[PDB]
Amino acid sequence: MQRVDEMYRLVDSTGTGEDRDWGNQTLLGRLLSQAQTVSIGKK
């Protein structure tokens, strides 16, 4: 429960962050979906 010096406020810590942008990763979302997979170490 709460104390008696905190009965004047009700809270809700559901949380909401930030929105990213508008058209953020449209190009990179197309390149990384058609990409060829090589082995690591090949620089």
Partner: protein
């Protein structure tokens, strides 16, 4: 303690209080003399003792659901709920140091620091009248007084 002093407005069972809201400027304790200033802010009076025409405006204790008592100081820069005292009510004031109250009915003047004192009623404004026979030594003790 048979005389519990945990409410600053004890003035009858049918008389409601008159409240003057406003903003804070400092952190004063409940039961001290106030004076409204420019803007909409309240603080301690800091006027002279020999000046008349002042309004009986004391600091009410803050609500229980905001961390308020008869000794908890107020938080600065916020809404301080105060009390304008009508004539004929009992209120708990706050006296200064080194004065004893012997007879019920002496004159209650106002010290310059925001506390009260027993002064001669010929050169200062008489606010209230004593109603309890106690002797105080530490500045900031609550003494019952009738506002007439």
């Amino acid at each position: 303690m048979a005389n519990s002093k945990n409410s600053i407005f004890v003035g009858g069972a049918g008389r409601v209080k008159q409240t003057i809201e406003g903003l804070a400027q400092s952190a004063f304790k409940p039961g001290q003399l106030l004076a409204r200033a420019a803007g909409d802010a309240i603080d301690v009076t800091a006027k002279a003792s020999t000046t008349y025409g002042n309004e009986f405006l004391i600091c009410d204790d803050q609500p229980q659901t905001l961390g308020g008592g008869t000794d908890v100081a107020v938080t600065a820069g916020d809404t301080v709920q105060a009390i304008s005292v009508l004539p004929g009510q009992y209120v708990l004031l706050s006296f200064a140091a080194t004065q004893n109250v012997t007879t019920k009915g002496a004159a209650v003047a106002s010290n310059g620091d925001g506390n009260f004192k027993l002064g001669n009623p010929a050169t200062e404004q008489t606010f209230a009248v004593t109603e309890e026979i106690i002797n105080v030594t530490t500045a900031g003790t609550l003494v019952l007084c009738r506002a007439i």
